[PDB]
Amino acid sequence: GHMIKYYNINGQQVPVENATLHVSDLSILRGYGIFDYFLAREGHPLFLDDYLNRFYRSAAELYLEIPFDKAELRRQIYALLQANEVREAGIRLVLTGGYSPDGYTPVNPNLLIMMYDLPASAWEFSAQGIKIITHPFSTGIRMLKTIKERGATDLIYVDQGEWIRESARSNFFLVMPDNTIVTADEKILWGITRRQVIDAAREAGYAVEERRIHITELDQAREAFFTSTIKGVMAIGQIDDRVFGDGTIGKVTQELQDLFVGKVKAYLETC
Amino acid sequence: GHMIKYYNINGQQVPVENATLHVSDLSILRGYGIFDYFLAREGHPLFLDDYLNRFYRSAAELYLEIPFDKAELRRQIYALLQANEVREAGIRLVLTGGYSPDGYTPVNPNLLIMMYDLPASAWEFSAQGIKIITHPFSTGIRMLKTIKERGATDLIYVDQGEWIRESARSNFFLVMPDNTIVTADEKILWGITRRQVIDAAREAGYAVEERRIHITELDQAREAFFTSTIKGVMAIGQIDDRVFGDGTIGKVTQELQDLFVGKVKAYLETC
Ligand SMILES: Cc1ncc(COP(=O)(O)O)c(/C=N/Nc2ccccc2)c1O
Numbered sequence: 353g354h355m356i357k358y359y360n361i362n363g364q365q366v367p368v369e370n371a372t373l374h375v376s377d378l379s380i381l382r383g384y385g386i387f388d389y390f391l392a393r394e395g396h397p398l399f400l401d402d403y404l405n406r407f408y409r410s411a412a413e414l415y416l417e418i419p420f421d422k423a424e425l426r427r428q429i430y431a432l433l434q435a436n437e438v439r440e441a442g443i444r445l446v447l448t449g450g451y452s453p454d455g456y457t458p459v460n461p462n463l464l465i466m467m468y469d470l471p472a473s474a475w476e477f478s479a480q481g482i483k484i485i486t487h488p489f490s491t492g493i494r495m496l497k498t499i500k501e502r503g504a505t506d507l508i509y510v511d512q513g514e515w516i517r518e519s520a521r522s523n524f525f526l527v528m529p530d531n532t533i534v535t536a537d538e539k540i541l542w543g544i545t546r547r548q549v550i551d552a553a554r555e556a557g558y559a560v561e562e563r564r565i566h567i568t569e570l571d572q573a574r575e576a577f578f579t580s581t582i583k584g585v586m587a588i589g590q591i592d593d594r595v596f597g598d599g600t601i602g603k604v605t606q607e608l609q610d611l612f613v614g615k616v617k618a619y620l621e622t623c
Numbered sequence: 624g625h626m627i628k629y630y631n632i633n634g635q636q637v638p639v640e641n642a643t644l645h646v647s648d649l650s651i652l653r654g655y656g657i658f659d660y661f662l663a664r665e666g667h668p669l670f671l672d673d674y675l676n677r678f679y680r681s682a683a684e685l686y687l688e689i690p691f692d693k694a695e696l697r698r699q700i701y702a703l704l705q706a707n708e709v710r711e712a713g714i715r716l717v718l719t720g721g722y723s724p725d726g727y728t729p730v731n732p733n734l735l736i737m738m739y740d741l742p743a744s745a746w747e748f749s750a751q752g753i754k755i756i757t758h759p760f761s762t763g764i765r766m767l768k769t770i771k772e773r774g775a776t777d778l779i780y781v782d783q784g785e786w787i788r789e790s791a792r793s794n795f796f797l798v799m800p801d802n803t804i805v806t807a808d809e810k811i812l813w814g815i816t817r818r819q820v821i822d823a824a825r826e827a828g829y830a831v832e833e834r835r836i837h838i839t840e841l842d843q844a845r846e847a848f849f850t851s852t853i854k855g856v857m858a859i860g861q862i863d864d865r866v867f868g869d870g871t872i873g874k875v876t877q878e879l880q881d882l883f884v885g886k887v888k889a890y891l892e893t894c
């Protein structure tokens with residue numbers, strides 16, 4: 353793996369061993385802050401402008417002012433890849449509520465850029481679908497316990513015992529026997545992987561329905577998968593007691609996995 | 624005011640100027656953590672055992688292990704009051720998700736004890752009730768904006784357009800014309816001030832109903848008030864367009880304010 357030498361705090365490259373915040377930061381005291389996370393390959397953060405747009409939208413929703421414009425943040429991110437001498441990386445952006453003279457009032461958010469090594473494994477996909485559970489409904493990390501204990505590696509939620517509700521971590525998709533792709537709607541552009549995969553499905557001539565999913569629809573679907581930054585397209589083989597196909601990646605899920613890699617390749621060709 | 628010289632990080636008294644966490648702390652990266660906040664007067668944290676019990680319960684709910692038992696944490700808190708040479712103080716306890724070798728897995732929570740000066744003003748109460756709004760339903764600090772903009776200093780929530788829902792920051796009480804005190808129920812002991820004030824009301828021979836409050840009940844109440852650690856008993860003079868009495872503290876709210884001071888005096892007599 354790779355020694356990461358530097359993070360970035362408020363536009364200054366800081367050796368990892370000195371990368372600290374004073375405990376008056378409102379993320380420490382009150383968990384007030386936003387983040388984004390994205391990959392880089394061949395020295396380029398993937399779909400970067402979409403991630404940065406999401407990051408600036410998240411900040412404005414919390415009334416936190418990012419201390420640099422998008423072009424400047426983009427420069428800092430590329431400057432940090434070059435300083436750490438990595439071509440493949442995970443990049444975390446953090447905007448805290450910042451240092452507050454009174455432990456409550458945001459007065460100046462703190463901006464962190466952190467960097468991680470990816471194993472070659474990060475870019476590979478399993479033919480074996482994962483096993484998840486449904487669950488009525490901090491919440492997300494708390495839930496790791498219940499999850500591992502039940503022999504699942506993730507979950508989706510049911511609402512009023514009726515409606516599938518996505519976790520924070522992933523977008524959830526069904527493929528119906530007629531090859532209709534079904535996924536929850538969005539008010540504004542949140543899922544970056546979700547967007548590239550819906551685009552790839554429609555370009556391939558698949559029907560994509562963006563709508564509420566009823567619990568009964570898990571029993572009608574041929575395939576189930578997640579999208580996320582880290583997973584890309586990840587096949588779900590089992591939901592509670594429901595096996596999808598033989599538990600291995602479905603036909604459309606496999607096609608969308610390959611088309612997503614195509615979207616990442618096409619993105620990198622424009623860099 | 625008072626120079627605070629020291630905080631406590633993981634059982635070590637640290638000069639405030641050196642009190643920092645490495646950015647791998649999961650409170651910085653993911654807002655994963657708990658806290659408690661309480662006052663001290665005459666060199667004693669108020670109702671300390673109830674606050675510590677709440678703190679240990681909050682931690683166990685997030686599967687975070689506090690590195691010291693209750694007696695040891697209590698010692699650290701008194702040792703910090705003595706090191707800062709303060710008799711009147713605000714004390715914040717923070718337990719973060721801690722430093723994680725992979726930015727996701729809690730591996731060792733970090734414990735912070737921070738200390739603040741109280742103005743003599745912190746112990747005084749206003750005869751003038753505050754002005755709040757109702758509102759359908761991070762959320763809490765985000766809401767300061769809407770609040771100040773509407774000429775309110777706080778809010779309570781309405782659920783399904785039907786039921787009063789308390790904010791995180793305060794417990795909400797009505798006093799009906801027959802002097803029935805009404806407040807939302809609790810599953811386990813959360814509000815410390817709430818508990819002392821309900822105890823004081825019942826000892827005085829008032830009826831206290833712990834139950835769901837319907838929106839229509841704001842129109843039937845003679846008085847409205849908040850309890851919290853910082854506010855003690857705080858009169859609410861106006862909710863949206865509803866003035867309570869002439870906007871000044873009601874009879875029962877004033878009696879409960881005096882009885883709460885009595886509970887604090889009695890507590891300090893046992894120290
Ligand atoms: C540009 C690019 N080129 C090839 C592969 C596959 O190399 P091969 O076809 O020889 O195995 C990937 C995989 N991404 N996988 C991925 C991307 C984002 C998130 C998760 C997985 C890629 O991103």
Ligand SMILES: Cc1ncc(COP(=O)(O)O)c(/C=N/Nc2ccccc2)c1O
Nearest residue numbers: 664745746747852853854855884887888
């Ligand atoms: C022990 C004790 N003794 C007196 C006063 C009042 O002094 P006087 O009656 O002469 O004005 C207070 C006020 N607490 N107020 C308070 C306590 C907790 C939270 C908020 C307010 C007190 O806590």
